[PDB]
Amino acid sequence: DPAPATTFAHLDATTVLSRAIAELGIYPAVDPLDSTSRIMDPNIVGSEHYDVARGVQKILQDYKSLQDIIAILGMDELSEEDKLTVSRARKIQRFLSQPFQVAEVFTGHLGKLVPLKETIKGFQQILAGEYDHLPEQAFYMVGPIEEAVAKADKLAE
Amino acid sequence: TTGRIVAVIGAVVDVQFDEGLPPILNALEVQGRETRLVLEVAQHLGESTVRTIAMDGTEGLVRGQKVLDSGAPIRIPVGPETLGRIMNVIGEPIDERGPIKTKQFAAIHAEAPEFVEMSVEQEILVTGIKVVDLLAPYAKGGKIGLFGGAGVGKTVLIMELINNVAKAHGGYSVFAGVGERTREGNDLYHEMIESGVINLKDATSKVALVYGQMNEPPGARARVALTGLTVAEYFRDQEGQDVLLFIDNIFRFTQAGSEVSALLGRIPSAVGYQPTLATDMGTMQERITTTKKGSITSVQAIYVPADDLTDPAPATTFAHLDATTVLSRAIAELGIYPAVDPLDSTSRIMDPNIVGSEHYDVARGVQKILQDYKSLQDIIAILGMDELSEEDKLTVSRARKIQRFLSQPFQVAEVFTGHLGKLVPLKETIKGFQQILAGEYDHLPEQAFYMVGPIEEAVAKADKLA
Amino acid sequence: TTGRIVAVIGAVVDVQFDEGLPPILNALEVQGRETRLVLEVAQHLGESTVRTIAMDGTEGLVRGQKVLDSGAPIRIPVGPETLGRIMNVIGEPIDERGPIKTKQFAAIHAEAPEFVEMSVEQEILVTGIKVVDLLAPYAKGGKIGLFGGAGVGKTVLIMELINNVAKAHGGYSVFAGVGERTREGNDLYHEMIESGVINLKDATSKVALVYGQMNEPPGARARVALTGLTVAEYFRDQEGQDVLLFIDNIFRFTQAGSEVSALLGRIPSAVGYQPTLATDMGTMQERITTTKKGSITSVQAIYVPADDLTDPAPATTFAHLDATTVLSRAIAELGIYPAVDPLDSTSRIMDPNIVGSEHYDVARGVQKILQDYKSLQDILSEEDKLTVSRARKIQRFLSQPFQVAEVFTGHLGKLVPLKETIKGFQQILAGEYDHLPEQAFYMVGPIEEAVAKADKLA
Amino acid sequence: ESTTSEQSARMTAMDNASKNASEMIDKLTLTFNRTRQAVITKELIEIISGAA
Amino acid sequence: VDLEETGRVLSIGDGIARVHGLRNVQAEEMVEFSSGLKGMSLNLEPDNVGVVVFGNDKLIKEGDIVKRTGAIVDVPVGEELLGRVVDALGNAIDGKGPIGSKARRRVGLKAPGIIPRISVREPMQTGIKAVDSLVPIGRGQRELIIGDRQTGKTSIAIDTIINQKRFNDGTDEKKKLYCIYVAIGQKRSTVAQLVKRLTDADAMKYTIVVSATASDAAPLQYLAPYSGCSMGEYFRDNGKHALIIYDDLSKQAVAYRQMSLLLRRPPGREAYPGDVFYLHSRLLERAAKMNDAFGGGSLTALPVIETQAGDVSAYIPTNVISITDGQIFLETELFYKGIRPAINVGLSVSRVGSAAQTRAMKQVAGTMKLELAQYREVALDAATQQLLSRGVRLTELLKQGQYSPMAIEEQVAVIYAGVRGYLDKLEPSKITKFENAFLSHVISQHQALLGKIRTDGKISEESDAKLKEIVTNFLAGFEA
Amino acid sequence: YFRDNGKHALIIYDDLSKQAVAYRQMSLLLRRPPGREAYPGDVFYLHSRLLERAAKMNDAFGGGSLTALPVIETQAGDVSAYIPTNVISITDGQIFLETELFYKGIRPAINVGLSVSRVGSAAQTRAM
Amino acid sequence: YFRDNGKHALIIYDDLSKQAVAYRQMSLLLRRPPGREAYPGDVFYLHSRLLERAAKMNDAFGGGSLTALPVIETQAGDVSAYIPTNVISITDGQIFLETELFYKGIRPAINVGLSVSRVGSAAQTRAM
Numbered sequence A: 001d002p003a004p005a006t007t008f009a010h011l012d013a014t015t016v017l018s019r020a021i022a023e024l025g026i027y028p029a030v031d032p033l034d035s036t037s038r039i040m041d042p043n044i045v046g047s048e049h050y051d052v053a054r055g056v057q058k059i060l061q062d063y064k065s066l067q068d069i070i071a072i073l074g075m076d077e078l079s080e081e082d083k084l085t086v087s088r089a090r091k092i093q094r095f096l097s098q099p100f101q102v103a104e105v106f107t108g109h110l111g112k113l114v115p116l117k118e119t120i121k122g123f124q125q126i127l128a129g130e131y132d133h134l135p136e137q138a139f140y141m142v143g144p145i146e147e148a149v150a151k152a153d154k155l156a157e
Numbered sequence B: 001t002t003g004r005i006v007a008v009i010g011a012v013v014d015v016q017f018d019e020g021l022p023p024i025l026n027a028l029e030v031q032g033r034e035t036r037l038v039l040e041v042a043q044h045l046g047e048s049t050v051r052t053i054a055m056d057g058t059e060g061l062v063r064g065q066k067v068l069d070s071g072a073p074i075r076i077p078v079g080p081e082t083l084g085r086i087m088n089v090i091g092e093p094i095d096e097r098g099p100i101k102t103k104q105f106a107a108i109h110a111e112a113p114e115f116v117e118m119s120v121e122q123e124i125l126v127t128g129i130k131v132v133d134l135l136a137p138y139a140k141g142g143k144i145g146l147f148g149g150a151g152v153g154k155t156v157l158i159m160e161l162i163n164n165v166a167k168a169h170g171g172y173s174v175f176a177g178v179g180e181r182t183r184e185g186n187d188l189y190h191e192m193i194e195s196g197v198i199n200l201k202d203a204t205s206k207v208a209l210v211y212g213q214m215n216e217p218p219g220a221r222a223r224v225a226l227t228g229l230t231v232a233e234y235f236r237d238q239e240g241q242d243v244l245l246f247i248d249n250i251f252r253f254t255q256a257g258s259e260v261s262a263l264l265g266r267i268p269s270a271v272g273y274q275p276t277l278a279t280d281m282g283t284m285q286e287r288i289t290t291t292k293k294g295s296i297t298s299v300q301a302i303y304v305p306a307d308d309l310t311d312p313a314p315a316t317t318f319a320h321l322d323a324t325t326v327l328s329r330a331i332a333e334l335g336i337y338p339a340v341d342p343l344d345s346t347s348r349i350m351d352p353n354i355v356g357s358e359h360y361d362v363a364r365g366v367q368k369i370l371q372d373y374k375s376l377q378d379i380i381a382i383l384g385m386d387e388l389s390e391e392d393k394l395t396v397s398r399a400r401k402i403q404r405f406l407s408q409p410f411q412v413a414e415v416f417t418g419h420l421g422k423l424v425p426l427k428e429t430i431k432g433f434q435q436i437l438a439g440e441y442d443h444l445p446e447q448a449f450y451m452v453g454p455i456e457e458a459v460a461k462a463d464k465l466a
Numbered sequence C: 001t002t003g004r005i006v007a008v009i010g011a012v013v014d015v016q017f018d019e020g021l022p023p024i025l026n027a028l029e030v031q032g033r034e035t036r037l038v039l040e041v042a043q044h045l046g047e048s049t050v051r052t053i054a055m056d057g058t059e060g061l062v063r064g065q066k067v068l069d070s071g072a073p074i075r076i077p078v079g080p081e082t083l084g085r086i087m088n089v090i091g092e093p094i095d096e097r098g099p100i101k102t103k104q105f106a107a108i109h110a111e112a113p114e115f116v117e118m119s120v121e122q123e124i125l126v127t128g129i130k131v132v133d134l135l136a137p138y139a140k141g142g143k144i145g146l147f148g149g150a151g152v153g154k155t156v157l158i159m160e161l162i163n164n165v166a167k168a169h170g171g172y173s174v175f176a177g178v179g180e181r182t183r184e185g186n187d188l189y190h191e192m193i194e195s196g197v198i199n200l201k202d203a204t205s206k207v208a209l210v211y212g213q214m215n216e217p218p219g220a221r222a223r224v225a226l227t228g229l230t231v232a233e234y235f236r237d238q239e240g241q242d243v244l245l246f247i248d249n250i251f252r253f254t255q256a257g258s259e260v261s262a263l264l265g266r267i268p269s270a271v272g273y274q275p276t277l278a279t280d281m282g283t284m285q286e287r288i289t290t291t292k293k294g295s296i297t298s299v300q301a302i303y304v305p306a307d308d309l310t311d312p313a314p315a316t317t318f319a320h321l322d323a324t325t326v327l328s329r330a331i332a333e334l335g336i337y338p339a340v341d342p343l344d345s346t347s348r349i350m351d352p353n354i355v356g357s358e359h360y361d362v363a364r365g366v367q368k369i370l371q372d373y374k375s376l377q378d379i380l381s382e383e384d385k386l387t388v389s390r391a392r393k394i395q396r397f398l399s400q401p402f403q404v405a406e407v408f409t410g411h412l413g414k415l416v417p418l419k420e421t422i423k424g425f426q427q428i429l430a431g432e433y434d435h436l437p438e439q440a441f442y443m444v445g446p447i448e449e450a451v452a453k454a455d456k457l458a
Numbered sequence D: 001e002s003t004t005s006e007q008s009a010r011m012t013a014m015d016n017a018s019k020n021a022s023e024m025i026d027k028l029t030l031t032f033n034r035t036r037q038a039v040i041t042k043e044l045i046e047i048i049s050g051a052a
Numbered sequence E: 001v002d003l004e005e006t007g008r009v010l011s012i013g014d015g016i017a018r019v020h021g022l023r024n025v026q027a028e029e030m031v032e033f034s035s036g037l038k039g040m041s042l043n044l045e046p047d048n049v050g051v052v053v054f055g056n057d058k059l060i061k062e063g064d065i066v067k068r069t070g071a072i073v074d075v076p077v078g079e080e081l082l083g084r085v086v087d088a089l090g091n092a093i094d095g096k097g098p099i100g101s102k103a104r105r106r107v108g109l110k111a112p113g114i115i116p117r118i119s120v121r122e123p124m125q126t127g128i129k130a131v132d133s134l135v136p137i138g139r140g141q142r143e144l145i146i147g148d149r150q151t152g153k154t155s156i157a158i159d160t161i162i163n164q165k166r167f168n169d170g171t172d173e174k175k176k177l178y179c180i181y182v183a184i185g186q187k188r189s190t191v192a193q194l195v196k197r198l199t200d201a202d203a204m205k206y207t208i209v210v211s212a213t214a215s216d217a218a219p220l221q222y223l224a225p226y227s228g229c230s231m232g233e234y235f236r237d238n239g240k241h242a243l244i245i246y247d248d249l250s251k252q253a254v255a256y257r258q259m260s261l262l263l264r265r266p267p268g269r270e271a272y273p274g275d276v277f278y279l280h281s282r283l284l285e286r287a288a289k290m291n292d293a294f295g296g297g298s299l300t301a302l303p304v305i306e307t308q309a310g311d312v313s314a315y316i317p318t319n320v321i322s323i324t325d326g327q328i329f330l331e332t333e334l335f336y337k338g339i340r341p342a343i344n345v346g347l348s349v350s351r352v353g354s355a356a357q358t359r360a361m362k363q364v365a366g367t368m369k370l371e372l373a374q375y376r377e378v379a380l381d382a383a384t385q386q387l388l389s390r391g392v393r394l395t396e397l398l399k400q401g402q403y404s405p406m407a408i409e410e411q412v413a414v415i416y417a418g419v420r421g422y423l424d425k426l427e428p429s430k431i432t433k434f435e436n437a438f439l440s441h442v443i444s445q446h447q448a449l450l451g452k453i454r455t456d457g458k459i460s461e462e463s464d465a466k467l468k469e470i471v472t473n474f475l476a477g478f479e480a
Numbered sequence F, G: 001y002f003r004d005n006g007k008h009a010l011i012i013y014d015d016l017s018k019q020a021v022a023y024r025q026m027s028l029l030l031r032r033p034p035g036r037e038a039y040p041g042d043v044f045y046l047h048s049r050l051l052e053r054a055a056k057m058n059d060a061f062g063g064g065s066l067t068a069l070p071v072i073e074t075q076a077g078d079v080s081a082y083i084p085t086n087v088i089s090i091t092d093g094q095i096f097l098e099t100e101l102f103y104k105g106i107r108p109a110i111n112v113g114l115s116v117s118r119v120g121s122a123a124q125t126r127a128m
């Protein structure tokens, strides 16, 4: 639409929200494959930050491209490498969701603020397969990665 | 007094008056024509000049040609002697049987019945058509709409209803042909003479006919529905009797309006339509109604441009109806006739407190299984039925049998189906679909359920196969 | 008579005349400007004023500037002297070689031949190219859609066509660059010089060039196809020839028409095209036909917008086409040249009634055996093995060395007569050469050379 | 016996699926292009109506 | 000078001339330009007359004199036009000299109402097996021919025209069918090739060709169908029977859309005007069957519509389907497979033709209709093995070459063999070969049976038993 | 009236799609040039000024309220359309109903993910 | 200046989409007739006049050159919109960039299958 389309060029950082994502209960409904920043540069944020960010985007784009194929032909048709990227991607999608303090009236969860250090570490570990054994939902609507571990323990009994 | 033509473009004629200006809606008479040419005042343009809409062709008109004010809107014969007769938009006999000597005339513009005049009576009208009776039943004195794209089955359906309802009905009928085939009018007229519902020798006719077909210019096609309504209004009010009103096809009213609007120079609305589409439709539709004074059971065939139900014409028509029968080309192409979309046809009396819980439950049960089948179409179209779970295969098999049991041979469509027409009692319709849903016929082949009447015929058909 | 400019809005110029107005389509000459500025009358606006479309830029124009009515539509040089030359839409030389010294000039707007002038005779225009002549033959007076982008040997095919039609029949060619990229207009010109179809030293040139370059106003690009048509019409209607007309690109002819219609304030039709889309196309295309005097046959490079074959532009153009030549990257990468897809290219005159019974059968046999070979690619028996080796030899015998690519390669280019082509593929289908090797059929002319290529290399 | 039947049946079903996919690609491409053209036409009619 | 009978062009350049004067001109009157072009008075306004020009507007200039003719747009009509090729105005374009026609009809005349008509009852025989058996056409009917480019649409029309030779060589004017072929938007070469074909088949002598081709101005293409229709109505209203083909109405609608956008009328779907339905409705309504009091004549119409990619649900296709009395649908996929004519049986419909089918055909075709409807879902257990075996052989009988339309009794004989089960033991690939061998046998040997079926219009028990023996004895004789 | 006198009222607008259509007619006939979908340039403002008048009043103004339930009809279930998103962009949430859900037996036919409330738990009893 | 003095220059137009938008503003406000996407009929002509000025000169005219790299922004990958279509047709080739390649890790996000250079091999060294 001409109004938002013309606005993009005036910005240094863009956070693009998506109804397709909000509809899933993923809040904030940020499209990780359509949000950009001038400072997303290894020389500015450092190689660790940049590598994890690009790694997260890659796994999510790989999953997005697979979703439609697996919806028709089935999960069992995927190679072990593909279904590993599926399960990790779905955990990554969930770990991007977060309870906001201003959204407590909507979520029923206490708001959380996550330090950048903890954000990088958390996604690093998921990407590295360190939580392959944990259920999907443990990663949904939490703050730091320690809460996902605690939630996984709580989800057992 | 007298006016003079100052401008002509198609159906739109501007006329200047020297003394006394006709009010909007007045019928003007063009002087010197071989057959009566009526102009209806639409607007006052200023400078003693009016803009009018012609009720017949404007070829041969000259600037300066004299026009007289009749002092009234178009007035037509109304009463018992319209029965057995055919009239045009302006109430002229078009059946070569001489004058229509009614005792009264009526203007074709009347105001809609007021809110205080409304009836809340909701009684089922059983049609004997399985899809309709089961899922979206018609009501006595109710407004029924038959939606369909080109060639899908609107007219066959309205003709079957005339066959199933009118004979069981005790009163008068009015058929308005609006922008449809002239030869369809010829067929209907002569078939009514043959059957005797029109009698040329006696006063025993039960049907009045009004026609303005697709050979007519748009002014005539825009107004002829009002002519039909006016005839029905008389029978409803001045006789307080049960009236049936059949209109084929009401879309043509709105299309004709679009043609004139383009000639009136209005700024166009969406899809090139007249900006007045909805109000024009409302002022007309609100007259097609039952009142405390008398009953009109109305059935209107509704054409759907390019099969697009979101087109402003059909889209605006929905809210004017108590029951809707929506036909589908995809369904017709699968061989299911009548080509009713069972998930897009509705009725206000589809209510457990009205039709009883048994009727309601079977209807909703049928619709659930059909919807469950529908939202598997994506996967089925690619991989076929053999990939589905046993659970989903069961729902597909029953839904396909239900789809087929919803088809029915019409008395009117015998040449096309090759089968004798069938009329099914409501209780038998309920029972048949009840048994299918219960899985009582899971063992029977799907084709057994195709083009039958009652469920017993599906059993007998399967027995002949195996 | 002399008029005066009363309006200038982009490439649209209004002119007032004191006496008789110039008819629609008349060329007007703007007075007092360095180069030549032609305005074509499009409308009579009333009050002695006409609306015109400019053939060049309108900058520097002043209201009141004098404008001369020429008395006719745009008139261009026609005759033998156009051959080897490059002219623009208004007939000016643009190759810096001086005036095009014809003894006749002709109006670019000319009515299509009348009903009584029509020929019912359906005749194959023999190109001498095996893929084309056998499977998707050209019809005299017909229109051929040329498909494929670049890198598929388009220009070499074009140059060989010009070479062959002049050599076999004795008919000349006309190339109309409609929306020509100036760089590619230069390349084509120098490639034609190298191939010999244009000769700068004598009068043996086989093509006349007409360029309407991309940086020219809508009016110029819209009319340049007509200019090319008019050059071709001379060779037909005055010299009784079977003429070839190339139009590169037909979509850019449509596009320029849409732009002109837009500039004149005409309300766009479906998909933004001019309301006159079909008549703009028809008045041009109908001039390409077989008459009693001769024929103009046209090869028209087709761009399909959005790869949508139902788009109004290609859909309207397709109504006028009698054949297709599909140039394919897949055929090119297999080393087969010309890179013509032998299954995708079709012709309306591939009929046992129009072409010979011998022509139809062999061509149908070549089609079947190439489709059956593709069917057996997925998977053989003795009958299947026989059909595979036959088809692979047919794939190669469809390839051809071109006369135009002789200095570049060194390999002798070949023009193959029609009956030599038919009997060549006939002798392969019958299995008469399944006794001989496969690659002896690659890059040769007449079948006698494929036998000799097996006789020499045994 | 089972694997001979299973491999034949998979070959069969996938042949038909690939055919159904082909027909759906054509059907969808046609819907795409009708919509593509309609969007352009509709936008233009709104522009023309506003200008007139 | 005479501002009542004459006027001067004020402006010209959007297909419309604005003319000052002409004070006495009628709405829809033909006017004449100085150059010799004709025009129609469309818009009568206080200060000017808007004139639609039936030719190239280059030939009209501001200041040109325009004259009244006093006549609502009309065309010559009559038998003098038979054998001739004319433009949209009815002027000869074949170089064969003057056309003698004295009478004229208004091109815009409204179709007959309800009372002058009677139900279609008389066969309009195409000579095409697929059509005459499964999609029968009656005299007075409108039957749409619809399909993608190059699917065989025109060929249906041409074979139908050629077919009428057998009736037209007779002396009974009631059985005769005079033909009108309207070319709209076509290539001139295509029309020329068409007349050549008709001439070779001795069909041109009972045919009028009206042509407004791709290079003719849009108003001429707009006009052509109406002009041809008036030439057809001459026969309809003279107690005779005419057949008209509009080839094609898609191109006419495009021409009208050009005119309408240039007039700045508000566009809708695909930029078509709101009266585009009415454009075709008023035209096709004029094909009609008249009652005996009106002379008993008829005009049958075969309008042609071109689809994009088989889409019959588009605006113009649906418009014409909502006008005509059924359609013959030609399908690219079938044409590609070599099925010719490429008629989709299941999707084709005749709404009124069954009453206009001979009893002879009604018999064998009704059971073929049934046997094909039972084949369009099975396309192995013995119950469905017979349904498939019969359906493929019947489909082979529906194949037909061009330019040799068949007598109805010859059609009834070939269909008889497949329906009664005289092809079941023969292989599907050899049915086509059998049919032609069987047809030459019945023509050469048994004229008495073919003549009797033709006269009676029915297969009686004597005819059925006699035909039973012939096919049995030929089947035993037919080897390879 | 109720709102400004310490009372509570609920208002239903059934429906605003039809109001927009009536307003479009008036505007086109006043010769005000059309915008998107032939609706007037300020079709948003038509609904936004109406719906803003639904409000909760502080105790100084009586503590009264007016709650609005406007109704919008979609075509083919497109919640993401022009006029729908116009009105979604005014209200404090929406209840989105679908035919698919309706016939599946999901009645009321509410799509949970696509429906929202912009007030949330603040409008609920502690029990709920 | 460099081109005409025997030197070589490279020009980047970043971007021509925005230039077209500015020209459209002027044309519409001058009440010139709108076309597809409200652009005027001379919008092709705008860009073709500009881009044809990039040229390689022969030795007779100094042997200089001007190379152009115009930039076009598409919307949701629509390379068939009006302005993209124009500039695609004008140029000698295109480098197509795509969002899903970018996020897959294909950076630069060039679609190698769709991108083309009609000059091709003529512009490469023997080593390449």
Ligand SMILES: Nc1ncnc2c1ncn2[C@@H]1O[C@H](COP(=O)(O)OP(=O)(O)NP(=O)(O)O)[C@@H](O)[C@H]1O
Pocket (backbone or CB within 6 Å): E148, E149, E150, E151, E152, E153, E154, E155, E156, E340, E341, E400, E401, E402
């Ligand atoms: N029954 C038939 N058997 C064999 N060939 C046929 C038959 N009918 C038509 N054809 C051929 O098919 C081709 C196309 O037929 P035609 O009758 O031109 O269809 P069309 O749809 O009118 N074409 P167009 O108007 O150009 O889009 C012609 O070459 C015919 O000779």
Ligand SMILES: Nc1ncnc2c1ncn2[C@@H]1O[C@H](COP(=O)(O)OP(=O)(O)NP(=O)(O)O)[C@@H](O)[C@H]1O
Pocket (backbone or CB within 6 Å): B148, B149, B150, B151, B152, B153, B154, B155, B156, B157, B303, B337, B338, B339, B410, B413, B416, B417, E321, E322, E323, E349, E350, E351
């Ligand atoms: N109930 C039915 N049973 C069998 N065939 C049917 C039925 N309804 C329609 N058809 C077929 O469809 C054709 C058209 O039916 P009809 O009721 O005239 O459709 P319509 O929607 O009124 N068409 P139109 O008025 O042209 O938009 C018939 O001639 C039949 O061939």
Ligand SMILES: [Mg+2]
Pocket (backbone or CB within 6 Å): B154, B155, B156, B180
């Ligand atoms: Mg109907």
Ligand SMILES: [Mg+2]
Pocket (backbone or CB within 6 Å): E153, E154, E155, E247
């Ligand atoms: Mg044709």
